[PDB]
Amino acid sequence: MIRFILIQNRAGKTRLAKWYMQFDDDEKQKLIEEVHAVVTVRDAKHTNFVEFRNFKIIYRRYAGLYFCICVDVNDNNLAYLEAIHNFVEVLNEYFHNVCELDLVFNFYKVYTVVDEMFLAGEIRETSQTKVLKQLLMLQSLE
Amino acid sequence: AVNSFVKDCEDPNPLIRALAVRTMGCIRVDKITEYLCEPLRKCLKDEDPYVRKTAAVCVAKLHDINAQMVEDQGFLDSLRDLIADSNPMVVANAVAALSEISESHPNSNLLDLNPQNINKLLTALNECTEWGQIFILDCLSNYNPKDDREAQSICERVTPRLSHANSAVVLSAVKVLMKFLELLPKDSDYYNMLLKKLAPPLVTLLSGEPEVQYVALRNINLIVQKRPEILKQEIKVFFVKYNDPIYVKLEKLDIMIRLASQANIAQVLAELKEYATEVDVDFVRKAVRAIGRCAIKVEQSAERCVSTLLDLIQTKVNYVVQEAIVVIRDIFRKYPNKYESIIATLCENLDSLDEPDARAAMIWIVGEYAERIDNADELLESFLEGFHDESTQVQLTLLTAIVKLFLKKPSETQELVQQVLSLATQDSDNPDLRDRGYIYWRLLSTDPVTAKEVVLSEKPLISEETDLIEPTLLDELICHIGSLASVYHKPPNAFV
Amino acid sequence: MIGGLFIYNHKGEVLISRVYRDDIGRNAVDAFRVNVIHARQQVRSPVTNIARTSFFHVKRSNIWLAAVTKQNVNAAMVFEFLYKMCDVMAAYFGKISEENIKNNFVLIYELLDEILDFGYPQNIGWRREGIKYRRNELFLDVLESVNLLMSPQGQVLSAHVSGRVVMKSYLSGMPECKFGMNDKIKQSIAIDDCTFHQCVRLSERSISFIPPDGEFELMRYRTTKDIILPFRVIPLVREVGRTKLEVKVVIKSNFKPSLLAQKIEVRIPTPLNTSGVQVICMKGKAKYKASENAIVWKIKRMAGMKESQISAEIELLPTNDKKKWARPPISMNFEVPFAPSGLKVRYLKVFEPKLNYSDHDVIKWVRYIGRSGIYETRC
Amino acid sequence: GMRGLAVFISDIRNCKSKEAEIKRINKELANIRSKFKGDKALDGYSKKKYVCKLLFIFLLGHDIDFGHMEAVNLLSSNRYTEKQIGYLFISVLVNSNSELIRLINNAIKNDLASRNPTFMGLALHCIANVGSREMAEAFAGEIPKILVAGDTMDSVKQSAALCLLRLYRTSPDLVPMGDWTSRVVHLLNDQHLGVVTAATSLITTLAQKNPEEFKTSVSLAVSRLSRIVTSASTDLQDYTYYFVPAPWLSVKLLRLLQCYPPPEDPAVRGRLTECLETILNKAQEPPKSKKVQHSNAKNAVLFEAISLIIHHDSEPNLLVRACNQLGQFLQHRETNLRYLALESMCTLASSEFSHEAVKTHIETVINALKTERDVSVRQRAVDLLYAMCDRSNAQQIVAEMLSYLETADYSIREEIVLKVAILAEKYAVDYTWYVDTILNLIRIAGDYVSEEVWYRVIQIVINRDDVQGYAAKTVFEALQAPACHENLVKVGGYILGEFGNLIAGDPRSSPLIQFNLLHSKFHLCSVPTRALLLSTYIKFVNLFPEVKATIQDVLRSDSQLKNADVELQQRAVEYLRLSTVASTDILATVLEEMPPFPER
Amino acid sequence: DYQRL
């Protein structure tokens, strides 16, 4: 099952982290620096599968973005990679133009979307169109 | 391109020739060496300092790869003869090549140098610049003086050399001359006037960037450990100013300790008093270490520093208390049976032990003054909870302290020594610890009569030896002062 | 010797990289980026070694200078080489900036290929013969830096001056120069120590040479004794309960009354718990800055053998009063038009035997510019 | 829309070095406390903007210390946005409180009695994302009431199922096993595939923990697999990504089946075989979408099918075909394909029917290791060899992997050395070869070996008896090397100091030569090292009084007697005093041969 | 300032 979720830039500024089990802040932050160190040294021509101690990380690039995903040992990785790709697709089609400023200013919207299709460490919703419909109906009311 | 490289090596213009040689010398393939063996012969022999220098560097680069080659040895011989060249740069890069290949070491290295070559390289030193001067200097840190004649002459030859490159060339010269201090201290007094000469240039080097200050300060500390009788009373100068980088501060304090004398007690105590007020943990620890070393150095400082460290003990900061613990252990090892009253305070602040070394110091101390303490037995018994995961050194320290205390007072440590011996003999993955346990089991079961002959024997003092280094290690560093080795304080036998 | 040579900016990316040996790998530069820029453990040494890999680092502007090797070379030579690289960069394109570094690819590559091969540094040598000047003129600049640690009890704790010579010559031919100063060691001063340019000949010791064209530095020297103190600072600290401090600082002008000081800066220490300070100044302007804990009083001009002082009321916030405030020294920064060392130039015998013009054809120009180095008065 | 949050974010984000932002955030902290404590707390825009700003500040890297009851206030509100922001604050900020927990319980139980996806969704999201004890206790049987024989909004059903799964992960003990499985094993056939996914998650967890309750699902789920594997070219494009119909549910049900033994029902097994063959055959034809994601999804389904096959083990021929297909992937162009294929081969090596094929591919594994230039694959192949290790294997394996250690960067060095030691311990045929491998490795790496490995080799040596002389001879032959490591000094000093009697016969290894070598290496030592050397010297004195005069000379130096270290001085005094007597009775008595080390 | 030497 999913341990936690990371989206980071080239420098390493922390915009989003989302956990599912009890964890302290100091270990969380240090994990942030070493996962940053691991991810930042790679490039395009490497398999997106890495193993460290008791966990494994999936991390795909977009322009200048690091999207890091932490899960258990026996989960089906490339399925999660497809899920992340679909996530990026739906975020792109949402704004008609995806950018870092959308993440900065629509953080609550991102929270709602990930809650709408990521809960308790598992995929919740996979259908793009239903997500879009739910988004349209829930953005409507105040 | 290799054929084009040779053709460019045949170009009338020397620049293209040198460019081709330089380009060939950098590529590392199995056949470049044998291929450029023939062109490179007539590039070492050419009507240009540029071409000859480039070909010398390329010979150096050539020998490093795939080149044992008889023609490579002919290259070496031609280069050695080209030491007699009219270009300072050509001979500079030639001797640089020679020194580098001297690192490749089938015991047949450097191949040369004798009085004639010595005069030639003196002339080169006159007529070359920084790089070549350093190459000559560190190449000549390999000669062995036959007698005082040439040593004398070369030392006047080099003494004026407070030169343009300063740090590099000057410290290389210091390397060479420190190597060639073999003459007895009071000769025809070139020795004494050289001793007077050395202080100014050494002082001048503390005025660069903080990093060269650090490098020079490391070197100075090493030399001071080697010889304290050079900067005898310049303790005033190296006082730390309040905006140094911290490492410079630390080693400056170490040198302060190295040079404190009978006149220096007041200034040193004041100095350590303002330095103690700093907030850096390492700074404070080394400062109280310096306090302890000053205490060791003389008796009035001893009593004053004991008083100050007791004050620091009632400051209740744990780590400084443990450092002062180690300090007072050393003091008792040097000046015993004078300050035993502090042991009660130490036992009161015995709950503040969180470091293995300080715990070992308390264990050894309570072992020592078992006659003083009737209560330390219960304390060490409480410390008996951790047999494993308590570091081997602490295990050995508790073992020896307990056995000695039992030797002194067998009436109430019988079951303790049998249980600790059983634990040592039945759980030790440490072979040496198991052997030691067996030794003391076959010793306390033989006679306390001989054990007190062995164990109870008193130990000699320390006599002001703060933070010294192994002699031969220092000597081998005196072979390599200017390089990384001196700063690292550890020989190339640990890094290759 | 040296293999890879890498440079960063403050943002941390690689700017220009060239490796002269097979030993160095990308792991080196990556570890340098992570363990220096991205490591928050600040306290270090200017050099470092990890897993038998030596790293050399220095920061100028916002630019890191990285050098890596495997063998036991001398550090000073490589450091001089790095300084030379930075200085030639500054000479070639002025201010060192990221885009300024970037727009010089061909320059960087040709210089690194020429000046440096496989880690080996490659490069009358100061003046040619065809230099001509119908107006034989030279300029003298006397730059001296004063350093003082001053006690609250009125004694000089430490004093030493670093002095350098700056001269601008424009003369015809191959002038033969003899420098004359009071080297008696009656006007006379003592030279504690001195280092020279390559042109200086050893054979009182006088300087005989042929000067390099234009501006150059003849010699570097240090002075520690018989230094004329530019200023005297009088500290006075008074405690007013737990709410106020009464500190009045008096400074003495220890130079000629005919000499007017310029750009006088006095930094008066105050605790961090200072609730406020009221500034009083009869000369210049006085300011209080609670941020950096200082009182700023600046004096435009104020004559020698004179005195000036500031009346200050330092209002303290009540706090843990048991830990008393450790007073930093009173620091002053200034520029003086005279040399604190006291050096006096007897003459400068410049003769041209080749060309048929006399010494009277030389226009010799001299001025003194003294600067403050470290000038702190403990209180 | 909303502008104030944007203005705030622009203001603080566009700041210089962090000190200026610190003063800015301090001024803003003063402003926000002044607005909250004191002033008028308005309902919608004022406090909404305030709490949004505070949340942005908190996520920026700072802390929020107040406005928690005024954060519960947003939960007790009419508007969707206010409650949503309040939920955001309470979920992101969870501190040690009890009144807050009770108020959250009250609000959640009051809001759950709604009839819209929004409210129950927000409540279930709050429960699942954080979770506490009492809040899970209040809906132990309430969530089932939603999920028994009651159908709500399908997204609401998904949320309830996932929340119950999260609570069971947190509190398996506090989850009843009432008669509600029937509908759970009924709704698997439901059309909505998201509900299918959530139910499959819950069923996977529960059935893998409680096999007995969910045995009914098998036939229905395999029928779902049969219908979904070939449905249409446009069946549920709502749930179809890049021409691939529902890969995730196929993978998930394949994983689901692994909690049970091979199905008994012949129809189920036959339809499963036909379906997997169909999977193979569609994998046969070239991809219908040149974008890689099509291939990724199809190969994901394929690999999960392979996992089902390997766990349940129905067919020998199918296993060999899977091995061949994976082998084809081991040199495939795609790197991720190679990684997943090699992992699946690591799994498949355990299949004894295709283990012969795997063994024939051990050379391919070696080549892929030596051609990777990607690090990870090499230690994965090392793990594969570890799995496939027997005696002869162990032999050629350790040869190749010591070569692959002399080609190793920094760390895989040390842990592969650790497994080399344990593998030699497990598979030692001749103990001379064992110590030979130990010395070869300490030669190759040296710096990164252990402190307990040589403990273990000393234990083995002292327990093996006969090899001790050969071991000592080999050690003495080894230490004559010019470059000498410091740990080699420890091991050689101990072994020779305790067995010098056997080896001193040879003049080249005479006791004189032994002591000469020891005192030569003496100056390359740590303090524990020279303590051990002192102990070996005194034991050597026990071995041969012949050299004792020189020995007595050596430790009599000022450097040792007036040494600045406690334990070294103590050892010197002890050895000097016992050599002073040297009655040869106590000297021999105390210094025995030493009983062999018992095994831990 | 500069003065005539």
Curated annotation (Swiss-Prot), chain A:
Changing residue 100 to Y: Abolishes interaction with CD4 endocytosis signal motif. Changing residue 62 to S: Abolishes interaction with CD4 endocytosis signal motif. CDD domains: AP2_sigma. The modification Phosphoserine is found at residue 140. One of its GO terms (cellular component) is AP-2 adaptor complex. Belongs to the adaptor complexes small subunit family. Adaptor protein complex 2 (AP-2) is a heterotetramer composed of two large adaptins (alpha-type subunit AP2A1 or AP2A2 and beta-type subunit AP2B1), a medium adaptin (mu-type subunit AP2M1) and a small adaptin (sigma-type subunit AP2S1). Interacts with CCDC32; the interaction is direct and mediates association of CCDC32 with adaptor protein complex 2 (AP-2). This is AP-2 complex subunit sigma.
From Swiss-Prot, chain B:
The keyword Membrane applies. GO terms for molecular function: clathrin binding; protein-containing complex binding. The keyword Transport applies. This is AP-2 complex subunit beta. It comes from the Eukaryota. One of its GO terms (biological process) is neurotransmitter secretion. Component of the adaptor protein complex 2 (AP-2). Adaptor protein complexes function in protein transport via transport vesicles in different membrane traffic pathways. Adaptor protein complexes are vesicle coat components and appear to be involved in cargo selection and vesicle formation. AP-2 is involved in clathrin-dependent endocytosis in which cargo proteins are incorporated into vesicles surrounded by clathrin (clathrin-coated vesicles, CCVs) which are destined for fusion with the early endosome. Expressed in the brain (at protein level). GO terms for cellular component: AP-2 adaptor complex; clathrin adaptor complex; cytoplasmic side of plasma membrane; extrinsic component of presynaptic endocytic zone membrane; glutamatergic synapse; postsynaptic endocytic zone; synapse; synaptic vesicle. It is a peripheral membrane protein. Keywords: Acetylation, Cell membrane, Coated pit, Endocytosis, Membrane, Phosphoprotein, Protein transport, Transport. It is found in: Cell membrane; Membrane, Coated pit. Belongs to the adaptor complexes large subunit family.
From Swiss-Prot, chain C:
Keywords: Cell membrane, Coated pit, Endocytosis, Lipid-binding, Membrane, Phosphoprotein, Protein transport, Transport. Residues 135-378 form the MHD domain. Gene3D superfamilies: 3.30.450.60, Mu homology domain, subdomain B. The modification Phosphoserine is found at residue 45. Disulfide bonds: none annotated. GO terms for biological process: clathrin-dependent endocytosis; intracellular protein transport; negative regulation of protein localization to plasma membrane; positive regulation of receptor internalization; positive regulation of synaptic vesicle endocytosis; postsynaptic neurotransmitter receptor internalization; protein-containing complex assembly; regulation of vesicle size. The keyword Flavoprotein does not apply. The keyword Transport applies. One of its GO terms (cellular component) is secretory granule. Disruption phenotype: Embryonic lethal before day 3.5 postcoitus (E3.5). It is found in: Cell membrane; Membrane, Coated pit. InterPro entries: Adaptor_comp_med_subunit (IPR050431), AP2_Mu_C_sf (IPR036168), AP2_Mu_N (IPR043532), AP_mu_sigma_su (IPR022775), Clathrin_mu (IPR001392), Clathrin_mu_CS (IPR018240), Longin-like_dom_sf (IPR011012), MHD (IPR028565). Belongs to the adaptor complexes medium subunit family. This is AP-2 complex subunit mu. It comes from Mus musculus (Mouse). The gene is Ap2m1.
From Swiss-Prot, chain D:
Changing residue 48 to E: Strongly reduces phosphatidylinositol binding. Changing residue 24 to Q: Reduces phosphatidylinositol binding. Its main location: membrane. It is a peripheral membrane protein. Expressed in the brain (at protein level). One of its GO terms (cellular component) is secretory granule. One of its GO terms (molecular function) is protein domain specific binding. A 1,2-diacyl-sn-glycero-3-phospho-(1D-myo-inositol-3,4,5-trisphosphate) binds at residues 3-4, 35, 45, 49-53. One of its GO terms (biological process) is vesicle-mediated transport. It is found in: Cell membrane; Membrane, Coated pit. Changing residue 53 to Q: Reduces phosphatidylinositol binding. Disulfide bonds: none annotated. Keywords: Cell membrane, Coated pit, Endocytosis, Lipid-binding, Membrane, Protein transport, Transport. Adaptor protein complex 2 (AP-2) is a heterotetramer composed of two large adaptins (alpha-type subunit AP2A1 or AP2A2 and beta-type subunit AP2B1), a medium adaptin (mu-type subunit AP2M1) and a small adaptin (sigma-type subunit AP2S1). Binds EPN1, EPS15, AMPH, SNAP91 and BIN1. Interacts with clathrin. Interacts with HIP1. Interacts with DGKD. Interacts with DENND1A, DENND1B and DENND1C. Interacts with FCHO1 and DAB2. Interacts with ATAT1; this interaction is required for efficient alpha-tubulin acetylation by ATAT1. Interacts with KIAA1107. Belongs to the adaptor complexes large subunit family. This is AP-2 complex subunit alpha-2. It comes from Mus musculus. The chain holds residues 9 to 607 of 938 of the full protein.
